[PDB]
Design a protein around this motif. Structure first.
Motif, PDB file in Angstrom:
ATOM      1  N   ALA A   8     -23.768  23.232 -13.704  1.00 55.22           N
ATOM      2  CA  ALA A   8     -24.816  23.944 -13.143  1.00 55.22           C
ATOM      3  C   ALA A   8     -25.971  23.077 -12.242  1.00 55.22           C
ATOM      4  O   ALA A   8     -26.383  22.143 -12.759  1.00 55.22           O
ATOM      5  CB  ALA A   8     -25.546  24.909 -13.828  1.00 55.22           C
ATOM      6  N   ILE A  10     -29.397  23.265  -9.902  1.00 53.50           N
ATOM      7  CA  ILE A  10     -30.532  23.895  -9.414  1.00 53.50           C
ATOM      8  C   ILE A  10     -30.619  23.148  -8.156  1.00 53.50           C
ATOM      9  O   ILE A  10     -31.324  22.070  -7.949  1.00 53.50           O
ATOM     10  CB  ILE A  10     -31.456  24.070 -10.460  1.00 53.50           C
ATOM     11  CG1 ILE A  10     -31.077  24.898 -11.439  1.00 53.50           C
ATOM     12  CG2 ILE A  10     -32.912  24.715  -9.884  1.00 53.50           C
ATOM     13  CD1 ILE A  10     -30.714  23.946 -12.748  1.00 53.50           C
ATOM     14  N   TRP A  49     -26.974  27.074  -8.038  1.00 49.24           N
ATOM     15  CA  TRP A  49     -28.025  27.988  -8.011  1.00 49.24           C
ATOM     16  C   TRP A  49     -29.404  27.551  -7.498  1.00 49.24           C
ATOM     17  O   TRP A  49     -29.920  26.554  -7.677  1.00 49.24           O
ATOM     18  CB  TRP A  49     -28.301  28.109  -9.626  1.00 49.24           C
ATOM     19  CG  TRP A  49     -28.577  29.539 -10.068  1.00 49.24           C
ATOM     20  CD1 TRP A  49     -27.727  30.637 -10.425  1.00 49.24           C
ATOM     21  CD2 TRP A  49     -29.694  30.116 -10.235  1.00 49.24           C
ATOM     22  NE1 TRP A  49     -28.226  31.713 -10.966  1.00 49.24           N
ATOM     23  CE2 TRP A  49     -29.502  31.426 -10.763  1.00 49.24           C
ATOM     24  CE3 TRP A  49     -31.153  29.570  -9.869  1.00 49.24           C
ATOM     25  CZ2 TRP A  49     -30.755  32.447 -10.993  1.00 49.24           C
ATOM     26  CZ3 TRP A  49     -32.071  30.547 -10.186  1.00 49.24           C
ATOM     27  CH2 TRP A  49     -31.930  31.835 -10.702  1.00 49.24           C
ATOM     28  N   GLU A 100     -22.771  35.240  -8.090  1.00 42.76           N
ATOM     29  CA  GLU A 100     -23.486  35.671  -9.294  1.00 42.76           C
ATOM     30  C   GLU A 100     -24.520  36.593  -8.859  1.00 42.76           C
ATOM     31  O   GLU A 100     -25.329  36.397  -7.919  1.00 42.76           O
ATOM     32  CB  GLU A 100     -24.243  34.157  -9.972  1.00 42.76           C
ATOM     33  CG  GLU A 100     -24.414  34.842 -11.499  1.00 42.76           C
ATOM     34  CD  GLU A 100     -25.629  33.850 -11.915  1.00 42.76           C
ATOM     35  OE1 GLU A 100     -25.199  32.743 -12.448  1.00 42.76           O
ATOM     36  OE2 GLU A 100     -26.844  33.805 -11.803  1.00 42.76           O
ATOM     37  N   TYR A 127     -24.516  37.666 -14.488  1.00 46.10           N
ATOM     38  CA  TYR A 127     -25.429  36.878 -15.487  1.00 46.10           C
ATOM     39  C   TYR A 127     -26.331  37.807 -16.085  1.00 46.10           C
ATOM     40  O   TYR A 127     -26.997  38.747 -15.558  1.00 46.10           O
ATOM     41  CB  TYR A 127     -26.328  35.831 -14.544  1.00 46.10           C
ATOM     42  CG  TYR A 127     -27.108  34.959 -15.342  1.00 46.10           C
ATOM     43  CD1 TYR A 127     -28.132  35.339 -16.030  1.00 46.10           C
ATOM     44  CD2 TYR A 127     -26.697  33.561 -15.385  1.00 46.10           C
ATOM     45  CE1 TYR A 127     -28.861  34.520 -16.965  1.00 46.10           C
ATOM     46  CE2 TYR A 127     -27.432  32.776 -16.238  1.00 46.10           C
ATOM     47  CZ  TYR A 127     -28.496  32.898 -16.896  1.00 46.10           C
ATOM     48  OH  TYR A 127     -29.083  32.416 -17.689  1.00 46.10           O
ATOM     49  N   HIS A 200     -24.659  30.064 -22.009  1.00 46.54           N
ATOM     50  CA  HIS A 200     -25.797  29.490 -21.384  1.00 46.54           C
ATOM     51  C   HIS A 200     -27.068  29.665 -21.884  1.00 46.54           C
ATOM     52  O   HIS A 200     -27.501  30.637 -22.394  1.00 46.54           O
ATOM     53  CB  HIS A 200     -25.717  30.182 -19.729  1.00 46.54           C
ATOM     54  CG  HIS A 200     -26.712  29.414 -18.979  1.00 46.54           C
ATOM     55  ND1 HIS A 200     -27.922  29.731 -18.338  1.00 46.54           N
ATOM     56  CD2 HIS A 200     -26.645  27.886 -18.547  1.00 46.54           C
ATOM     57  CE1 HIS A 200     -28.733  28.924 -17.734  1.00 46.54           C
ATOM     58  NE2 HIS A 200     -27.639  27.940 -17.712  1.00 46.54           N
ATOM     59  N   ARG A 201     -27.865  28.138 -21.791  1.00 50.99           N
ATOM     60  CA  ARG A 201     -29.125  28.064 -22.583  1.00 50.99           C
ATOM     61  C   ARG A 201     -28.949  27.749 -24.163  1.00 50.99           C
ATOM     62  O   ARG A 201     -28.347  28.419 -24.923  1.00 50.99           O
ATOM     63  CB  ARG A 201     -30.050  29.312 -22.292  1.00 50.99           C
ATOM     64  CG  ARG A 201     -30.306  29.612 -20.735  1.00 50.99           C
ATOM     65  CD  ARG A 201     -31.061  28.590 -20.004  1.00 50.99           C
ATOM     66  NE  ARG A 201     -31.633  29.419 -18.688  1.00 50.99           N
ATOM     67  CZ  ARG A 201     -31.634  28.582 -17.572  1.00 50.99           C
ATOM     68  NH1 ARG A 201     -31.404  27.347 -17.647  1.00 50.99           N
ATOM     69  NH2 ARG A 201     -32.197  29.326 -16.576  1.00 50.99           N
ATOM     70  N   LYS A 221     -21.876  26.605 -20.062  1.00 48.40           N
ATOM     71  CA  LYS A 221     -22.535  25.938 -18.927  1.00 48.40           C
ATOM     72  C   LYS A 221     -23.529  25.272 -19.484  1.00 48.40           C
ATOM     73  O   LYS A 221     -24.464  25.765 -20.313  1.00 48.40           O
ATOM     74  CB  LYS A 221     -22.822  27.040 -17.608  1.00 48.40           C
ATOM     75  CG  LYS A 221     -23.391  26.316 -16.457  1.00 48.40           C
ATOM     76  CD  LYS A 221     -22.963  27.115 -15.410  1.00 48.40           C
ATOM     77  CE  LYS A 221     -23.730  28.616 -15.246  1.00 48.40           C
ATOM     78  NZ  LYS A 221     -22.954  29.405 -14.599  1.00 48.40           N
ATOM     79  N   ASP A 223     -26.798  22.084 -17.561  1.00 51.79           N
ATOM     80  CA  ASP A 223     -27.265  21.509 -16.429  1.00 51.79           C
ATOM     81  C   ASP A 223     -27.941  20.251 -16.769  1.00 51.79           C
ATOM     82  O   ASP A 223     -27.323  19.042 -16.711  1.00 51.79           O
ATOM     83  CB  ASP A 223     -28.138  22.438 -15.625  1.00 51.79           C
ATOM     84  CG  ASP A 223     -29.071  23.098 -16.625  1.00 51.79           C
ATOM     85  OD1 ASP A 223     -29.944  22.258 -16.962  1.00 51.79           O
ATOM     86  OD2 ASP A 223     -29.192  24.310 -16.297  1.00 51.79           O
TER      87      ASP A 223
END
Ligand SMILES: N#Cc1cc([N+](=O)[O-])ccc1O
Length: 252
Positions: A8, A10, A49, A100, A127, A200-201, A221, A223
């Motif tokens: 991912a 940003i 993103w 998304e 998401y 994610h996270r 995912k 980043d």
């Protein structure tokens, strides 16, 4: 299926925020060169993103999509400020494989059946941002600040039913932490939907990814963890294979 390692990126103003630590690139901060690099070394899908708010920010995305779509071989997903069908349609057509949506999805859930009917369910990523509120998983919106009062049990079945193609499962409690994917949340969602589930996270170390797939995640995912070079994508994939995860390697 196999299991994906999605990376991912940003963006502000078509730049990668804080860039990357691969000294071999020409422009560490250039998403196109970074994104295409990740597609040469193991990443399976890429997320672009965009945290731009600005005036001509819809153009900068349609630009970068176009440049990215001619160059990158794996699937690309876009999200960031996508609030209506106009913006998604324009993004899929300019070169985006999937768009998304989040807040706009929960605020009008037919925007996903809309995007789906035109471009196919495979083009729609919802998401879902959730955190525990009083022992109970709630869906949050607006960058995870507005407690919508929709409990996740129900949003995950609605999202599937309205035609989404896959869910990104982001645990707000894990923002910035490097303790691991909320594997309780993944296990809680897993039986509610046949949709593919992207964790994610949380990611902080290799073994977090093994945990995420045993909890039922179809993909994970991350980043910063890859851009900082905390987790070398190829190492990460040989590990996941070592301990029985189905991931595609290359082998030279
Ligand atoms: N996917 C994704 C994603 C979402 C957010 N977000 O909903 O704040 C931020 C960074 C991201 O890579």
């Amino acid at each position: 299926l196999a299991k994906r390692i999605d990376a991912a990126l940003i963006l502000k103003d078509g730049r990668v925020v804080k860039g990357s630590n691969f000294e071999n690139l020409r422009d560490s901060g250039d998403p196109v060169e970074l994104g295409k690099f990740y597609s040469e070394i193991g990443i399976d899908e890429l997320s672009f993103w965009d945290i731009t708010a600005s005036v001509e920010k819809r153009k900068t995305m349609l630009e970068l999509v176009e440049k990215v779509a001619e160059q990158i071989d794996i699937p690309i997903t876009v999200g960031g400020g996508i609030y209506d069908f106009e913006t998604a349609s324009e993004l899929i057509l300019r070169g985006a494989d999937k768009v998304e949506i989040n807040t706009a999805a929960v605020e009008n859930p037919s925007l996903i059946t809309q995007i789906a009917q035109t471009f196919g369910s495979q083009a729609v990523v919802v998401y879902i941002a959730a955190k525990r509120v009083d022992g109970e998983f709630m869906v949050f919106t607006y960058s995870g600040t507005k407690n919508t009062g929709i409990l996740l049990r129900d949003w995950v079945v609605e999202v599937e039913k309205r035609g989404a193609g896959e869910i990104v499962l982001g645990s707000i409690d894990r923002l910035g932490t490097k303790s691991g994917y909320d594997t309780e949340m993944i296990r809680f969602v897993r039986p509610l939907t046949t949709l593919p589930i992207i964790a994610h996270r949380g990611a902080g170390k290799t073994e977090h990814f093994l945990e995420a797939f045993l909890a039922g995640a179809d993909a994970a995912k991350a980043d910063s963890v890859f851009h900082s070079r905390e987790i070398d994508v190829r190492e990460l994939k040989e590990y996941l294979k070592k301990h029985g995860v189905n991931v595609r390697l290359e082998g030279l």
